[PDB]
Amino acid sequence: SNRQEKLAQLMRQFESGGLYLRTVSDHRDEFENTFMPKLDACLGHGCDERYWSSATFIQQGLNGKVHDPHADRTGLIISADARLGGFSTFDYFPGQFPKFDMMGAYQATWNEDIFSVDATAVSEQQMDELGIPDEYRSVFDFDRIQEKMAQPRLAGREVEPTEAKICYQPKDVLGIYVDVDSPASQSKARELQQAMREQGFDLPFIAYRGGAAQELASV
Amino acid sequence: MQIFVKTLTGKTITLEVEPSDTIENVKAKIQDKEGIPPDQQRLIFAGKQLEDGRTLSDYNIQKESTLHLVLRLR
Numbered sequence: 429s430n431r432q433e434k435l436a437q438l439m440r441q442f443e444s445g446g447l448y449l450r451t452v453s454d455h456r457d458e459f460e461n462t463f464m465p466k467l468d469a470c471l472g473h474g475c476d477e478r479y480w481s482s483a484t485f486i487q488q489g490l491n492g493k494v495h496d497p498h499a500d501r502t503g504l505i506i507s508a509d510a511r512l513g514g515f516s517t518f519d520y521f522p523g524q525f526p527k528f529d530m531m532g533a534y535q536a537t538w539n540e541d542i543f544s545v546d547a548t549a550v551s552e553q554q555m556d557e558l559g560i561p562d563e564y565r566s567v568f569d570f571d572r573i574q575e576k577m578a579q580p581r582l583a584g585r586e587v588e589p590t591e592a593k594i595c596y597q598p599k600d601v602l603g604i605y606v607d608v609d610s611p612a613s614q615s616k617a618r619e620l621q622q623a624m625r626e627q628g629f630d631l632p633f634i635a636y637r638g639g640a641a642q643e644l645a646s647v
Numbered sequence: 648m649q650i651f652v653k654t655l656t657g658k659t660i661t662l663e664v665e666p667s668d669t670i671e672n673v674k675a676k677i678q679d680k681e682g683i684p685p686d687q688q689r690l691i692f693a694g695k696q697l698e699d700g701r702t703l704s705d706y707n708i709q710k711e712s713t714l715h716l717v718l719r720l721r
Contacts, residue, residue, distance in 0.1 A: 526694045531715050547694030
């Protein structure tokens with residue numbers, strides 16, 4: 429798809445069921461050591477699920493923050509069709525994702541039996557007998573992400589960065605994240621967008637903030 | 648190597664340790680800084696409670712990992 433087609437697909441997903449936003453500390457590391465190996469596989473014997481990455485769920489009307497401690501990252505806007513490994517509101521091989529937040533759950537219930545189980549390998553039955561509240565559980569499909577985030581979205585309440593483990597493929601990359609308050613973010617995004625276009629993936633710049641997304645000309 | 652320990656009041660403790668250290672030795676080291684006997688300690692990592700008798704390597708606990716200290720009775 430061309431740039432306009434990606435932009436349209438991005439906004440369509442953002443305005444309906446949402447999608448993912450992955451900030452990156454090192455755009456060259458992400459391009460050279462994650463995107464390019466994914467692409468080589470896709471154009472070779474086929475795409476594979478070698479590389480898993482952290483990203484935040486974004487969606488129109490959901491005032492969600494992204495992970496950027498120094499307000500200086502660029503990043504990738506990634507399709508909701510990316511393969512999902514696990515999602516939580518609190519914050520790699522599939523199977524490593526915790527079913528629930530042990531320390532969070534303990535500080536909610538003060539049920540010391542929480543410490544008798546392994547939170548990466550506990551049955552939904554066990555978790556019910558333990559009394560683990562739903563806000564401390566992870567979810568593992570996209571519809572459950574939407575449901576988990578529906579109450580803050582409809583409330584218009586600000587929330588912290590959420591974490592999905594995803595495995596994106598090159599076709600899933602729909603946009604380049606730009607922090608409009610950061611010179612560094614815009615400098616890095618510029619370079620990253622140029623490198624991806626040169627590979628055949630021409631992406632729009634996207635200002636995301638506070639449940640709203642906007643296309644940018646150049647940064 | 649250096650690992651960290653967080654309390655349920657938010658305190659961060661630092662610990663010099665080696666991967667062959669048993670969980671017993673890690674707790675002895677917390678005892679020296681916090682005065683908590685090891686039998687009153689739970690150490691949590693990656694959603695699991697660590698077992699005395701096993702080591703840091705048995706849990707693949709690597710440098711700069713953060714543990715979570717919870718007090719218990721015995």
